[PDB]
Chain A
Amino acid sequence: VVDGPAMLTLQVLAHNMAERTTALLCSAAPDAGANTASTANMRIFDGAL
């Protein structure tokens, strides 16, 4: 149940919007605290839209 002047105020769509989604991939290393010689080659990838 949504009346006229609610969706009439959908006029404000012109101000902000979003174009499309984008997969973000920025990986990481072990921390200061587990970063040793064998773990220096270690990477962990994380994906998100």
Chain B
Amino acid sequence: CFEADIAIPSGISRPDAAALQRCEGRVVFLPTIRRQLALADVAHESFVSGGVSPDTLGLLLAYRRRFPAVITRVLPTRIVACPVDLGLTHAGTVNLRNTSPVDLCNGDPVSLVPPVFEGQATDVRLESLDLTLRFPVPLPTPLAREIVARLVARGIRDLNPRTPGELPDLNVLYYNGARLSLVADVQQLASVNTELRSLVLNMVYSITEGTTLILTLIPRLLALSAQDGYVNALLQMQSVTREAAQAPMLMQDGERRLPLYEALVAWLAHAGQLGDILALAPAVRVCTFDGAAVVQSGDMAPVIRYP
């Protein structure tokens, strides 16, 4: 585990000692690797920057440059945390707590998302030690990648107004059913802006010279549309692909460079990496020993290493 401890610094509200008991299996973001550390850098008051608190995109950027840690065992003197970034060498598969409305799967990669849900705030309050605690919500990673694209684009609509007030909310989610509504309260600009620029600048490099030949086959896409099932379902209705349909540009130097093969490389370099440069890295994977295929809300799932 390469054991790391966090002590109980000063006093105890006597029911709130039991509040630390039911947080077993949650995640602490501690911005270090320590053998002992105070509880002051733990809470959300440390997540608050100079003067201002981060938004749910800034908390992504706040959870960027800190280190997650697993609650292992809860003492009245200390709390032993295992440093996820290094000390994931656990054949004992140190256990986590699922605090999420989604019943997951077996075999999901699990990445951490700030509490942004309408009813799972994960707000526990300490008044003897005046601190506020937001636990991250562990979620499956495609469902995690369906969230971060919404919240930045919702903040993309925070730059430009123009349109009438009835906008698509980006606030109805879909997992097999299960209509989810999240919170849209505040959108800090710099958390939107720096997230928007890497969405711009990576999509710059992901276009290359041999990429341009693919753009010719855009009318070839709709030729498969009215003659099969798979393509017509692949072609989205709310897509620009159905909108843009309504050429080599020769410039041929040398022609032994494999121009089409080189196109799919650098496109995958930056447009292939769009979930992980915006959000947190997944290192938690669902692995139950008993053959249980799903893990209930509130359960203690065994946790294995990087996916």
Which of A35, A37, A38, A40: most chain B CB closer than 10 A? A37
Closest to A38 in B: B227
For chain A, residues 22 to 49, give those with C-beta under 8 angstroms from any C-beta of chain B: 35-38, 40
Closest to A32 in B: B226
Interface size class of B (residues with CB under 8 A): under 10
B219 to chain A, nearest CB (A): 16
Question: In this assembly, does B209 line the interface, its C-beta being within 8 Å of a C-beta of chain A?
Answer: no
B231 to chain A, nearest CB (A): 11
Closest to A37 in B: B227
A-contact 0/1 string along B250-284, CB 8 Å cutoff: 00000000000000000000000000000000000
Interface residue SS majority, chain A? loop
Question: In this assembly, does B228 line the interface, its C-beta being within 8 Å of a C-beta of chain A?
Answer: yes
How long is the Cα–Cα vector from A26 to B227 in the complex, in angstroms? 25
Which residues on the A side are within 8 Å of B226 (C-beta)? 35-37, 40
Which residues on the A side are within 8 Å of B227 (C-beta)? 36-38, 40
B302 to chain A, nearest CB (A): 50
For chain B, residues 205 to 231, give those with C-beta under 8 angstroms from any C-beta of chain A: 226-228
How long is the Cα–Cα vector from A38 to B226 in the complex, in angstroms? 10
How long is the Cα–Cα vector from A35 to B228 in the complex, in angstroms? 11
Which residues on the B side are within 8 Å of A40 (C-beta)? 226-227
Closest to B227 in A: A37
Which residues on the B side are within 8 Å of A38 (C-beta)? 227
How long is the Cα–Cα vector from A38 to B293 in the complex, in angstroms? 43
Which residues on the B side are within 8 Å of A37 (C-beta)? 226-228
B242 to chain A, nearest CB (A): 14
B235 to chain A, nearest CB (A): 15
How long is the Cα–Cα vector from A40 to B223 in the complex, in angstroms? 11
B74 to chain A, nearest CB (A): 63
B238 to chain A, nearest CB (A): 20
Closest to A40 in B: B227
For chain A, residues 2 to 38, give those with C-beta under 8 angstroms from any C-beta of chain B: 35-38
Apart from A40-B226, A40-B227, 7 more pairs, CB < 8 Å: A35-B226, A36-B226, A36-B227, A37-B226, A37-B227, A37-B228, A38-B227
A-B contact pairs, 9 of them (CB 8 A): A35-B226, A36-B226, A36-B227, A37-B226, A37-B227, A37-B228, A38-B227, A40-B226, A40-B227
| B interface residues with partner A (beta carbon < 8 Å) | 226-228
Nearest first, the 7 A-B pairs at minimum CB distance are A37-B227, A36-B227, A36-B226, A35-B226, A37-B226, A37-B228, A40-B227
